[PDB]
């Protein structure tokens, strides 16, 4: 099934090869159908799906029968097909982005959860892993913004998930499923045909609510989550140095880690979003992709690519060292004042969790609710970009003050103390 | 986050703040400033290199300065910018070479040798002083401003120890080089402040001009005494505007070469500075020099103007030009940049808008002799965009408003203006002219006299088929500009029809007729293309050619114009056959020095490799350039014209073509290549004919025509010129015509070259074009050069008929088939169909029609119908209805469904139409060209019942788009015949989206007024008025108001009364009854008149 469906998205070549621009004279002088196009996007979407199912009913399998699963066909299929869907010069489907990585997970997920796990390494070539990796470095540098999520708008920089293909699909409930309604408008219920019943292309779209970009955001937000997750996973794999763990892992995870605390700090605190944990659960995330990366696999972390991002590998782990201060919390009193100012949507998730959907959240007996006004704040603390936790504040502590690499000297070090006191 | 706030100025002023506390020597600032700085370059969608370089010619400026103490901070600053430190450098050596030369003699030069060239034992001596040689101009200029270095000994001497291996002293005699005064008046900073430094080197730069032009081979060595401003007497200065106007069009020329940067080598600091010394010489210059190169400064702040960051700087430039320049000369420029004034006012922030508003109160105070009575089109335009707010700002200026309105007649300064190049005067004039038509329609006094609307007309119609490939958006403003005309009466309106004329005759060998064909050439293209010329490489170009020619017609070099001369009559009245429009635009390059060969890279290519796959642009331009510089050897006079066709649109290449192919022609006796390139062309001809035509979807096959058309050009042009040459041959030399045996060799050459690759093919090759009457002109030479008797007559009949039965004519068709083609009696049947007797011939070919044999038999019924306005009988055909749907995709059949969906508009009904689209949309690919204009007005009239407004306004505008790039075809070749098909398609689509746009009764019955004086234009021809009254009559009776229904009465009642009289009651009595149903007290009179032209008398 893995292989038919691998090779049916390859009949199906020009869903995922639509161009980036159009020509100036592409007339839009046209019966404007959306019918043929709702099929195949629907062909591709449930076919990624089923891809992501068929490797997660074999992840469920007992671990010693994989290689019944995997060969050199089934490796180069999915190259092929995970290529196509990571797309560079063609219009993306993002629909298809949340499971081509998905299946990238399971794999690095099962090559770390199974005996045999050379006959897997040794099946796989080191070339699948440097075309699969760079496009993930692709993935990981654009951006998630709200009021351009749903937009039509400049390409490979805001993961956009388009107007024209937004419906749930097999695993996941991705979007606000605006296209459902076209499902069951595509056949006549009444009558036995072949050719689709027509579906307007120009009606859909009629500007309520920018909630929904608000949970889409949510959704692109776990799949940078992903993408540094399976990073992990895959530092996990070749602990030893390869073509692969090589030291872009300091460049484009530093990158991603200074620009989504930079902008954080400038843009996001005071926003009231919903996605505001999970952005700064990013950064709290991939500074853990640094550290063992910096910890453990110091051996290819070469002295150039270091010099490579000498400003944002500092300059971020300066941003949680900065929090050692803490003059801003400090007491119970004015901390809940911070969090009706940044967090009153975790306010209103915990009222609703505490009086409907937690069982322990009902006649709290004056040991869990001080649990919650310890964990509450620690929260908006996270949130306000000062006082991060102090597990993280020794991990930044530990990659710029110990000597595996001189990233400041002592002239230059103390210059970065005497910024927060010290 | 302050620098993300600002513009251009603050933009740079603030990235060299946050430059210099970068290399504030504390690590905390330094990593600090890394990170915000990348950051900054992503969110804008950038890389920091294109960030940071438009101030590295000013950041490491200064750095010449220091470079052997930081080294860390340059060290910063290139692992910063992500690129080698080699490579930023050779790239930005023109900015510190010139600082790194002129300071302390211990040098840095010795280390931009160590980067420059890897290693020691790469050589640092030849690479330093070819690099001293390489930006030598900016060093001459940094040595006469920055420091004052007025003695050649103190320049010469600081280049031999800079350098021991410099060449013969300087370089020498290169300091009255064009360059090296560019680079002097690029370095003129300035402001709105003037400060004592600000006037210190403006002084400088002034004193060093008078160094280097007006006497220098006086005074190479006797300068230190020109450093001094006042010590100038009087008796001088008319040397220096001698000799400054002799060199101020070349560094023009450098100007126009470093702002239009086609290798995409720097930044736009070049461009900043260039404008800046356009403002030097628009201040610090005589009157006249500025007057002379006008067209320069033109088309310099055009480019100022569209690119976007040097925007500011360029209106400043223009604000110094608008005041110190009068009011007749500014005429030639005024509109290029009024139009970018109104089309990109939009995105003009406050300091914009500021300078903007101190153009245009300048222009209205100071300068309305201009604006009221030289040119009144730009006073409306201003008017004319309230958004800007004119009237409001002094009040005085609408006392001359309210009248300048009325008093100027305004369509042929509409007319002369659509054919124009840029792309924003002839946005300007599009949406100046729907606004006027809509004032003009309501003012229900447009003029149609018997100043012509047939001018605009035209002019739209060479707009929309010039821009058929570029640019969707001006073609739909285009056409809906001529649907706001609508049809126009056939008899009473008339195009221009100039081909009785001059007629473009112009023998090539004698010299009189020579400077006759090079005045009118420069009179009426190369003068216009002289200003509204894109980049400036073109109007440097045109401004080649046109100096050639001149001095090819003996008027350059000899100085004779001033009147001091006179003894010049045959010369000055020579020269007084231009107009005044092309005299003070030819007048000052006379005497200028363009020099533009460009040689030896040329590779002249064998023929009949074809371009066609490329273009049809692509194309003519390369054959046009391999035949005229393979045929002319530098005298004859269509040498120069090479410089002109690589960077032609396609238009004069098309215009030589004929010229340089017919002087190919005369060359003889072959011997020479001159004929042998003839068999180059021939066979590409070959080429051009015998071709695929197939496989290639719409856009190469219209290529094709237009590769047709052009050379269809070339034979009737030979045919012309050979008719005239006999005329003038038998005119003046003598009168009997026969002499010499050699102007016959002449003669013979164009015989062959218009019999080969003969008729039955350019007939067959044209028919295809469009170009009917010249397919009917073809298929009777081949048919008299044919021996007619034989059988040859079956293959040459059934597309000469098709050359008939749309050319409008048809008393010849109806005799073509009555005589020699009396085989068939289908033949027969054909006649009654254009005789009276259609209805006849129509029962004929529906049970012909129900045969289900051939394909074409039954479109040849379904097109009688629609010519027969039978639109209720298309609708109902069986061919369609299998049972109630219809077939797959369409081979033929779509010629089938641009019937029945064209009949499905004009019977308004909502079912029918709507079940139809359903069936069209079930379709995947419609190619069609023709089936998707009545598709999107049939979705028009869907929205149109469904009471969307919006909806049937996009629509149409589709509908509008079509039309303007696909339907629409060149005008001054067409009839107006031809045309009136589609000028009824876009009268019946103007009043679709007039009558939608409409939100009560109170506005629709004046609609409808409206409508019924447009309905006064139309002429009495039947077949638009029942198009557009059958129009109106689907638009209300999809729109279920009770208004709308008494208006459709009204449509029914015309339609009855109209059909009446034009001999057509077949369908006067089933569009009367409708009347009846509403009970009109009209309809038993009209009914009475049905009765009477039926034929019965007594009832």
Known sequence: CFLFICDLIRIYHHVLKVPIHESNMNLHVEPQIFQYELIDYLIISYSFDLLEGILRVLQSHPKQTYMEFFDENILKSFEFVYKLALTISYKPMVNV??????????????????????????????????????????????????????????????????????????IRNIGDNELGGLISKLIYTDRLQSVPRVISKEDIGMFTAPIIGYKMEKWLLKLKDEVLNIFENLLMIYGDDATIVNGEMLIHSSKFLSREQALMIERYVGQDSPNLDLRCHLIEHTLTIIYRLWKDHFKQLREEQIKQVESQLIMSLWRFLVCQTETVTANEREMRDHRHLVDSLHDLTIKDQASYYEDAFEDLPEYIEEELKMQLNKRTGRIMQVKYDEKFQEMARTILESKSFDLTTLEEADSLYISMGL | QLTLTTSNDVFDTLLLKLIDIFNSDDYSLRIMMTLQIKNMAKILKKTPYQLLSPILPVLLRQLGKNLVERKVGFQNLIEL????????????????????????????????????????????????????????????????????????????????????????????????????????????????????????????????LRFLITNFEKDKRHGSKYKNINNWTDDQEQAFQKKLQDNILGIFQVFSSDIHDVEGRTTYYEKLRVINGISFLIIYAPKKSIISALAQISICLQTGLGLKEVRYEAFRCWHLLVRHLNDEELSTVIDSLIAFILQKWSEFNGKLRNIVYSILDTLIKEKSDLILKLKPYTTLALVGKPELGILARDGQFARMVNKIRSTTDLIPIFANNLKSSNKYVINQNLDDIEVYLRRKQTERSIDFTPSDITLVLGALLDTSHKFRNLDKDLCEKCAKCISMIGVLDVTKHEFKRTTYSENEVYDLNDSVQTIKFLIWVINDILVPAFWQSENPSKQLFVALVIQESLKYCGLSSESWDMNHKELYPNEAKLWEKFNSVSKTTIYPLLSSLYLAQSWKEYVPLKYPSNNFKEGYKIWVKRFTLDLLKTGTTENHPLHVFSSLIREDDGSLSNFLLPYISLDIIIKAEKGTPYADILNGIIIEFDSIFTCNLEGMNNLQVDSLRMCYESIFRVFEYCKKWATEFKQNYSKLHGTFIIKDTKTTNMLLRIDEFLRTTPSDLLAQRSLETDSFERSALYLEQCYRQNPHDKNQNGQLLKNLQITYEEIGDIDSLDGVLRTFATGNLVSKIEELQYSENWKLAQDCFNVLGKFSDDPKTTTRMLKSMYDHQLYSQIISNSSFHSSDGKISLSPDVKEWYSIGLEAANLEGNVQTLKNWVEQIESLRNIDDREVLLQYNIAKALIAISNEDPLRTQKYIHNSFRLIGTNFITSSKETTLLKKQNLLMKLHSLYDLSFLSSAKDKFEYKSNTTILDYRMERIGADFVPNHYILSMRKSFDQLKMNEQADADLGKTFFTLAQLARNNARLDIASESLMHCLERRLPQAELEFAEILWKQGENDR
């Open chain 2, 81 to 208: 910018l992500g690129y080698s430190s080699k490579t930023i450098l050779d790239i930005f050596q023109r900015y510190i070479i010139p600082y790194a030369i002129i300071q302390y003699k211990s040098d840095v030069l010795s280390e931009i040798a160590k980067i420059m060239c890897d290693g020691d034992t790469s050589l640092i001596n030849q690479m330093k002083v070819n690099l001293l040689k390489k930006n030598s101009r900016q060093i001459f200029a940094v040595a006469l401003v920055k420091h004052g270095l007025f003695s050649l000994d103190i320049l010469e001497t600081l280049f031999l120890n800079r350098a021991p291996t410099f060449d013969k002293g300087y370089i020498t005699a290169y300091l009255p080089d064009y360059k090296t005064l560019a680079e002097i008046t690029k370095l003129y900073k300035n402001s709105v402040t003037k400060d004592a430094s600000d006037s210190e080197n403006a002084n400088m730069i002034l004193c060093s």
């Open chain 1, 97 to 170: 982005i949340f499971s081509a990585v998905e299946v990238v997970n399971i794999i690095t997920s099962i090559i770390l959860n199974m005996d045999n796990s050379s006959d897997l390494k040794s099946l796989i070539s080191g070339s699948w892993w440097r075309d699969c990796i760079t496009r993930l470095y692709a993935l990981l540098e654009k951006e998630i913004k709200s009021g351009d999520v749903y937009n039509e708008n400049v390409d490979t920089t805001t993961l956009h998930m388009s107007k024209y293909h937004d419906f749930f699909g097999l």
